[PDB]
Write a protein that binds this ligand. Structure first.
Ligand SMILES: *C(=O)[C@H]([C@@H](C)O)[C@H]1CC(SCCNC=N)=C(C(=O)O)N1
Length: 239
């Protein structure tokens, strides 16, 4: 419940960021840089959540389709394989979502993103990269509401599409608890911005949504977004 101690894990991991908690439309802030919570950032791979929903709902793909790897080299060897939407989500495989995005196309993408009102709701002109280098931007409080709605099936999509994307996002399962969430890491902008947006599904059915945002640098291990989040949810006794 403090708020000062959570400042000190942020203090020591020599980062700058904010953890936004939403418990039934009540927003709390934690970190060492609470001002981040209202500044716009590129969403990075957290936009895969809304990309999937738009693609599924408009029947540009489905949860069974297998995306074929056509042999070109990709940033990670784990990405060099055939995979579904959901497997691409768990690995944040940009090429699959770029292909998806190109099927949706610019008009449909822009119309949906502003109908959802996602962040600043601007995708510019290149349909396959606006979530990594602009011009699409989003504050971390806006991300905790988005994933909050998704968790309660309240987004302006059908419920079956939402439920489909939610099963793509299961991260841990321990003690009757479930953690869902999506990581992001914009490595190609300065300063780098890391994301971990999701929700906790407590055994009694309660839902607490979070959006960890932090400045990033090339040397940190990717698990730093998980470490900081997990021990903050334990400190706040959400888990
Ligand atoms: C999403 O935010 C980025 C995007 C900018 O490429 C990618 C890069 C990193 S690391 C890839 C993890 N691979 C696999 N098993 C992530 C991320 O997972 O946070 N997403």
């Amino acid at each position: 419940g403090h708020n000062q101690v959570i400042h000190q894990y942020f203090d020591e991991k020599n980062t700058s960021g904010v953890l936004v908690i939403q418990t039934d439309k009540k927003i709390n802030l934690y970190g060492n840089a609470l001002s981040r919570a209202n500044t716009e950032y590129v969403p990075a791979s957290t936009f895969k959540m809304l990309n999937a929903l738009i693609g599924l709902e408009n029947q540009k793909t489905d949860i069974n389709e297998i995306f074929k790897w056509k042999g070109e080299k990709r940033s990670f060897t784990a990405w060099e394989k055939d995979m579904t939407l959901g497997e691409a989500m768990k690995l944040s495989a940009v090429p699959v979502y770029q292909e998806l995005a190109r099927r949706i196309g610019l008009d449909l993408m822009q119309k949906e993103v502003k109908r959802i009102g996602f962040g600043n709701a601007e995708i510019g002109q290149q349909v396959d990269n606006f979530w990594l280098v602009g011009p699409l931007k989003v504050t971390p409080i806006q991300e905790v509401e988005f994933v909050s709605q998704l968790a309660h099936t309240q987004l302006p999509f059908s419920e079956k599409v939402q439920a489909n994307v939610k099963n793509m996002l299961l991260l841990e399962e321990s003690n009757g608890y479930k953690i869902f969430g999506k990581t992001g890491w914009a490595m190609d902008i300065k300063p780098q911005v890391g994301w971990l947006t999701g929700w906790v599904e407590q055994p009694d059915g309660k839902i607490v949504a979070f959006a960890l945002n932090m400045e990033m640098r090339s040397e940190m291990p990717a698990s730093i977004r998980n470490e900081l989040l997990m021990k903050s949810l334990k400190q706040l006794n959400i888990i």
